Amino acid sequence: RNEHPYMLADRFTDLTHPELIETQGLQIDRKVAIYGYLHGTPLPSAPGTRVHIAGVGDFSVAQIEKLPDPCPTPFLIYAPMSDNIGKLIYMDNISPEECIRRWRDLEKFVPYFDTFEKLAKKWKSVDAIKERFLTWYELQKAKISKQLEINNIEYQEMTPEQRQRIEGFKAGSYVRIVFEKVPMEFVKNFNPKFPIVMGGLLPTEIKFGIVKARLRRHRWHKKILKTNDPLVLSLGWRRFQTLPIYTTTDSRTRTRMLKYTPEHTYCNAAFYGPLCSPNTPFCGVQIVANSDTGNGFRIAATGIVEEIDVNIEIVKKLKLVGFPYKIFKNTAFIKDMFSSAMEVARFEGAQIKTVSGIRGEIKRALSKPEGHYRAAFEDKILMSDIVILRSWYPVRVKKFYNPVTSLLLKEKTEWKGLRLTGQIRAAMNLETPSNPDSAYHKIERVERHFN
Amino acid sequence: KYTTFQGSQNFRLRIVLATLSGKPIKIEKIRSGDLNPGLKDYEVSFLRLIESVTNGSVIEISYTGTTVIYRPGIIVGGASTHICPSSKPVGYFVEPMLYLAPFSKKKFSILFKGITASHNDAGIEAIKWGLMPVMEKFGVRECALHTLKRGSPPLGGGEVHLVVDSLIAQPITMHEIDRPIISSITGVAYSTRVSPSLVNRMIDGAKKVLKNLQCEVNITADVWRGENSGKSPGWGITLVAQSKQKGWSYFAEDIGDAGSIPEELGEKVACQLLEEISKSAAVGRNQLPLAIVYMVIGKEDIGRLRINKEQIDERFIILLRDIKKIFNTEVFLKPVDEADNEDMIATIKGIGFTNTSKKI
């Protein structure tokens, strides 16, 4: 709130034209005055600022007019919705040569000069420029207060720029705004119970891209969070349902994909979304409606934004498992991890390992048993030992982005979006994609003798 | 539908201001009334330079070559190299990166192939001792620029390597009001792959016009030997006035082409240095655009800076008009109170812009 120009709205006016709304018949983009009181940083007075109002999406201003405040103070209730040179530069029509000629080419970096001979006649003597040629906390507090007083002092200047077009609706002033492109359902369901806030976007938070953050299962949330499992982020100003993907730098060499989040620690995460500054925190909710509330805690994941870009690359493990059928001493013939001579010809020279944890290397294709081929190892493979080829298939984020847009609904709660994986499975009455050999068992080590 | 330009002018600065503000840009009518119209080879290479520096920036060129679209992206930098075309030296390709540079995810180590210096463009000792100090006082701390090997027109063979790795959040706001006292006048004279008499007869022929001036003169010689000399013979002279009490610099240049007396070029550069310190106050006439771009791109403050009256040229007008039609920031002008010289003071409410690319 110290670096964003924000504003609660307390008064609302749908100044369209009634003959126009009767003309098109309930289809228009209702231009709307919002009479409110702004806070935060000064609002940039040039019309065209991106401002996000909550629960409809972000718009841009069209005209802004500050008014005398209806609830002033000594130098009282108010209840709406209830009972020369500078202009010589900046005027646009004239040419810069006309500007300089009535005041009295930039690819070429060197500044334009004149004839060197008369320059030398000018500077045969040099006496003109010969006059020119002769605690830490309260430290920073003094620096910022000195900045604030020179700020106010050089704001104390000529009126029409430092009061309405160079410093911009300074701090805490009652204003009227006019938007366009506001959908009809906002005005059609304008309940004054629910608030309508707004905040001026920075340039760095209008662009969409992929954010890398560090999440956490919230410590009173009862359920772990799945990858590619939709949740609604309260990042910054917006609130949007997106599809996160959770990664961990496995000892800071990579960014590999997980399946869920850890139970008690911070883990990295990535998702599509609008951009924001780094080092900014957010909350993130599961189901927001009221039909599905239960006795459960609603806040799912908190955490801050690490950094942002437009394309990250995350991988995941996949182990091409094979089977020996013909072992030898120190080498073996392995089967059906690959299927073709061209596949093993791609993978000539790759390292592998066994489930007994011994290293190995896939040496050459076998010719006729087209899947099978020949590999050498540290010592003897048993016939009952599955080999493993560690590889990294790259996955990528989904570009899904619904802002919640709560105050356009018919009912203003019971908001729905993408449901969770468990409940869409329960809705179409499927069963969880289990696997019979994947399940653990009470293992039974027997005392293995030797010959 | 966002921001649109006419005329094949000011092109590097329009692209770097688009990349700074984050706004996209159309530019139409790139020399449409020409016998050989369209976008030049060196500026096409400049756009490929920009696309290698940033990430996610999309650019379309007209098939007639007379317009260019640019949606920017984030700047990521990276350790790369760039061959530069022989139509244009490396100062032209390093000067817009010199103030797009301190804001990426990573450092800047982008070393340039090709011709070192030229007449119209920025020399390398020019860039160093006249654009490093203004940035070091604006708020960057480790910006360096080395020469692996020099070059010369028109054969080139020059290799130049800049690094910046003080990735600051935003430049601080400058408050320079006075007329800065000059503490020393230094300079260097280089010769790539000719005889070593040229440098000394440059230095003495330069310093004879300012031996009468009281201030201490120091010009340093450098020949360039062996393979490091490059592929064309040439020589040049750099003058820099240093204000060490607060750390400013003025600078003037030239190179000497074929059929040119080094004594006369040395005193020509010294008289153009006197020209610039006449026309200048606290910033150079070529140090000006980088400085005001930094003061508009720093923090949400008032940045004030004093210039004398003759700085205001058609370049200043077109730069102010361009910076308005990117992000609508008027500059206020404070005339100084002792006005036998009507010195303006550019005060700009800076945007509170910062880089949002850092790993944090």
Binding site: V310, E313 | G56, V58
Partner: peptide
Amino acid sequence: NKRGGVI
């Protein structure tokens, strides 16, 4: 890692 381009 790169996304943009020149066309």
